[PDB]
Design a protein around this ligand. Structure first.
Ligand SMILES: NC(=O)c1ccc[n+]([C@@H]2O[C@H](COP(=O)([O-])OP(=O)(O)OC[C@H]3O[C@@H](n4cnc5c(N)ncnc54)[C@H](O)[C@@H]3O)[C@@H](O)[C@H]2O)c1
Ligand SMILES: NC(=O)c1ccc[n+]([C@@H]2O[C@H](COP(=O)([O-])OP(=O)(O)OC[C@H]3O[C@@H](n4cnc5c(N)ncnc54)[C@H](O)[C@@H]3O)[C@@H](O)[C@H]2O)c1
Ligand SMILES: NC(=O)c1ccc[n+]([C@@H]2O[C@H](COP(=O)([O-])OP(=O)(O)OC[C@H]3O[C@@H](n4cnc5c(N)ncnc54)[C@H](O)[C@@H]3O)[C@@H](O)[C@H]2O)c1
Ligand SMILES: NC(=O)c1ccc[n+]([C@@H]2O[C@H](COP(=O)([O-])OP(=O)(O)OC[C@H]3O[C@@H](n4cnc5c(N)ncnc54)[C@H](O)[C@@H]3O)[C@@H](O)[C@H]2O)c1
Ligand SMILES: O=C(O)c1ccc(C(=O)O)o1
Ligand SMILES: O=C(O)c1ccc(C(=O)O)o1
Ligand SMILES: O=C(O)c1ccc(C(=O)O)o1
Ligand SMILES: O=C(O)c1ccc(C(=O)O)o1
Lengths: 269, 269, 269, 269
């Protein structure tokens, strides 16, 4: 039984993490924070995610609930996450970090603290996408040399960056497995007279529409046949499920910097 | 009896056009060109498509065979097609144009010449795509105002123009049905920080891979749901049989700009 | 002001219908049922969807709340729906029916009752599917005689009936537009040595997996090409908003069998 | 130099095998069969595939040409393939089997004869499908326990067996990687009231349409996400080149049951 503290439990990710920890039978929702000024401080965590009463409340500082949790799941903001890390060090807790947008200096501090603390830190927690990165590697080794490699992704209308960071992550897994640098081979746009396709290029096609949570397809195309590997994200919940999966696994692990690769056992397939 | 000249008879399309005209008894394979630089000049057209001798040869200039043909079928390159148009004007011939990748100025020239010459011009000669144009119009009247409209197309690695003339044809059908001009709303590339999607934009995504004969998808995406209309082309014969069908039909006709909509009687769908 | 009773309010649809009626300003959530043996009987309707308190409870029989509602919205199970229909007849109420999986005998009954009662019945309450039924008709007239017609649908793991009522709806639209009866041509299972496909058959393929809200594809396949018309449902709110929109529209109306085509004004597309 | 007999050389596969053996410089087209009642009996094999005369004819019985060949390539029908296996046993020949749709009893016979005869048997001779079998094993270990697993396949209108042997091959790879037997968990048809999906079932959906060379998708579906691994076959030459490559490889080998996984050296991927 793993006792989970959800940092910023009112956030978009937070609320999903609470719901996800609730649904995992090996995990217990034990604690939850929000910003001190927030009025959700005091509210029961189950009522927050629309799922009945848990007998736990949102606190304004996880420090205050240290003794009731084993592992912190933290998808908040850089400064907050660094304070939660420091708590782990001090009180012998573990942390699953989902927060992004750290400075280089701050990323260096995490690496240091991860020598004393069990830390999971990943740029994506989807079980399916990480499984897909591995499968792409296998496919690239077998077919990459002689196939045309295309990456196509669809997202909702509000997404401001193209292509997706997950698409770029698929490119890198492929390029790396083939001993290449993605920036050497990547083609992001095709407009007008492009000429004949190059042999080594990895082409990116980007769709922006509706409320699409996230679709990714990597295509390996040969004359005569093609292999398509596709991930569909249906619910921002899936990331939360993965992060909880990671917290369970991280429980009673030694100190170290761990990734989803490690959690899912991708290296030993 | 309709006497057909196949422009660039050695091309991917050209060879299929020859074979298609051969299979239609209302049509006679009468003439065939290639680039002057080519050594195929003097070779027999039937031997070229692997179907026995025809007693017709590939000339380097269709000008030299003007009395042997009624209609030119032209799936080559923009400059070549413009020359063949000029021949039609001067010698009272007809043309079926399949070539894509024209500049707007060049499309304006074709509109002009089509006042004097019977011209069939379509970005796609397949029944299914032309049906699809009509369906897109319906979908656009119902959903187009409040949906995000995305066009995605995949072709084989040798295609030199992006996006496909068929994709542009889908955009025009949709825009026109909504009382808009495609050029106002179209977005052909999405790279880096694009910002939030605009409401009226039609996005184009272009895949180049393998031996793909042709895939098109038009997407109407609302929050909560989407409608996808997809065409898949399996065989270049689909295009070639259509283009020959169009040539036979064009023989009877007066000057004008015609489409496969016209040929197939699909206008009042 | 239209007073809505939501049948089976605890269900996947029921809860979304409650939320949808709540958000529609012309409609009021007035009543709600669940199965008699259920312990949700007595709970406040707003609390079930985490919507706050409504001052309305889940009854075990809509008969008990008859004076509080004008229209029943019913997405439950066949026998339950027939009982609610009976209520409508006896007390001069209207019904919007979403339930699928009725026997032919039962559908004949609904047609009979709909002579005395205002009834909306559709297999799908989304705009996109109802648009799609119209597009299918067009596609069937043009391609249906040459093409092989296949209908493939995916739904979540809990759906109890196959194939979907929406798929059957697509089959009927197609068959009817081609002057056939669906039951003559439909093929619902393919196992073992089936032989060569017949020419007129409409094939049904059913996928059951995960949390899939609903995917439908009608395929028109010819040698050399195919046309695929696809609907993807992303959120049950698409259905629920439509069904509520249908209830509001039904309030004004006399006895009769209506469809979403009627509600949305799509009959003469 | 490996002397190849092509069984049923007139068939869709047979003709492509002839063409493929012709193009492979280590192999020679030595012999070829058709059904005795067939009028292609007597015709030269080269003329059949449209690439000139070979000085080899289509016999009505490979028994008659036994001294001219080392290996039989057999993509015909179950009874025919069993006779050719019997011929291999009697005269010390090898066989590459592509035929699908064997009964359980007949597959046991092939296993027995493969103790005395060098046999390659695979449901798909493509590189991409065999790679896919490996990728499915990976996905099945990571996601198979908690996901719904669905297999969907599309083929041309002439295919006589359902589901595809390749789909059954994907099921077995998945089941086997999860320590299960496919026959325990497979569900081939879903019609009417099926109830809620069981957890462990592998669902098979079969599409028969047009000229589809071959599409396969294996779906791993969890609540919130899914992973889709898809193979598309565009040209029968993919199969034929592989089968010939298998025949060349089989020439050196002793008695045994081999697969493409063996031929391609993919077992440790
Ligand atoms: N696939 C993924 O791995 C994935 C998916 C979504 C988001 N993210 C990451 O998660 C982070 C935030 O997620 P979001 O934008 O959906 O949620 P959000 O920004 O809406 O919520 C952030 C929450 O953190 C809380 N917070 C901030 N300071 C705090 C403090 N001192 N104490 C307690 N709580 C505090 C906020 O009050 C808020 O509730 C981002 O860095 C983002 O990069 C990752
Ligand atoms: N509208 C349609 O339905 C349709 C279908 C298929 C292809 N296309 C388009 O048609 C064009 C041809 O495509 P392809 O894939 O067959 O290309 P391809 O390059 O195989 O064929 C082009 C041929 O045209 C020839 N050519 C060029 N200039 C010439 C000249 N002056 N005289 C004679 N021949 C000349 C070339 O020598 C070559 O043989 C492309 O623009 C493509 O986009 C259109
Ligand atoms: N037309 C559409 O747009 C559409 C959309 C979704 C679902 N459906 C159909 O609607 C029906 C229900 O779907 P669901 O996924 O929401 O199922 P569900 O099981 O989640 O919900 C059905 C609810 O009805 C309740 N119920 C059963 N018997 C009852 C009774 N006698 N009195 C009161 N309540 C009772 C159940 O207890 C349950 O809460 C199905 O038949 C489905 O095929 C139609
Ligand atoms: N394993 C694979 O990679 C793969 C790939 C494609 C097709 N197939 C399978 O291979 C088989 C052949 O498919 P197809 O599309 O080529 O079928 P087809 O009907 O086109 O060809 C079968 C041929 O075998 C011939 N034949 C039948 N009985 C014979 C006999 N007793 N002696 C000699 N010839 C005989 C037929 O006359 C015919 O020409 C099918 O079972 C199909 O599922 C397997
Ligand atoms: O137009 C033809 O079909 C054509 C022209 C010439 C021949 C032939 O030699 O068979 O066929
Ligand atoms: O629509 C097109 O542009 C189109 C259709 C077909 C091709 C091609 O094969 O290059 O290009
Ligand atoms: O058309 C249907 O039957 C349909 C649409 C949605 C559902 C469901 O969720 O069960 O069923
Ligand atoms: O896996 C198969 O059964 C298979 C693969 C290809 C075909 C066919 O073309 O009939 O059948």
């Amino acid at each position: 039984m793993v006792r989970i503290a959800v940092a910023g439990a009112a956030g978009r990710m937070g609320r999903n993490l609470v719901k996800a920890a609730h649904h995992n039978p090996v995990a217990k929702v034990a604690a939850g924070s929000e910003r001190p000024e927030s009025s959700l401080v005091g509210v029961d965590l189950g009522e927050l995610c629309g799922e009945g009463k848990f007998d736990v409340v949102v606190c304004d500082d996880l420090a205050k609930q240290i003794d009731q949790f084993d592992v912190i799941i933290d998808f908040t903001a850089p400064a907050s996450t660094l304070n939660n890390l420091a708590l782990c060090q001090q009180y012998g807790k573990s942390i699953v970090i989902g927060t992004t947008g750290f400075t280089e200096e701050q990323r260096e501090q995490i690496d240091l603290v991860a020598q004393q603390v069990p830390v999971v830190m990943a740029p994506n927690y989807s079980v399916g996408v990480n499984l897909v990165f591995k499968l792409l590697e296998k496919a690239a080794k077998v077919m990459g040399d002689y196939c045309d490699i295309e990456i196509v992704e669809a997202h909702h209308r509000h997404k401001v960056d193209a292509p997706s960071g997950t698409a770029i992550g698929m490119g890198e897994a492929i390029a790396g497995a083939m001993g290449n640098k993605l920036s050497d081979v990547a083609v992001y746009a095709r407009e007008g007279i492009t000429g004949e396709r190059t042999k080594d290029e990895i082409g990116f096609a980007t769709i922006r529409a509706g409320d699409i949570v996230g679709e990714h397809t990597a295509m390996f195309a040969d004359i005569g046949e093609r292999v398509e590997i596709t991930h569909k994200a249906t619910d921002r919940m899936t990331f939360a499920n993965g992060a909880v999966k990671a917290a369970v696994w991280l429980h009673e692990k030694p100190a170290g910097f761990y990734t989803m690769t490690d959690v899912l056992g991708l290296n030993d397939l």
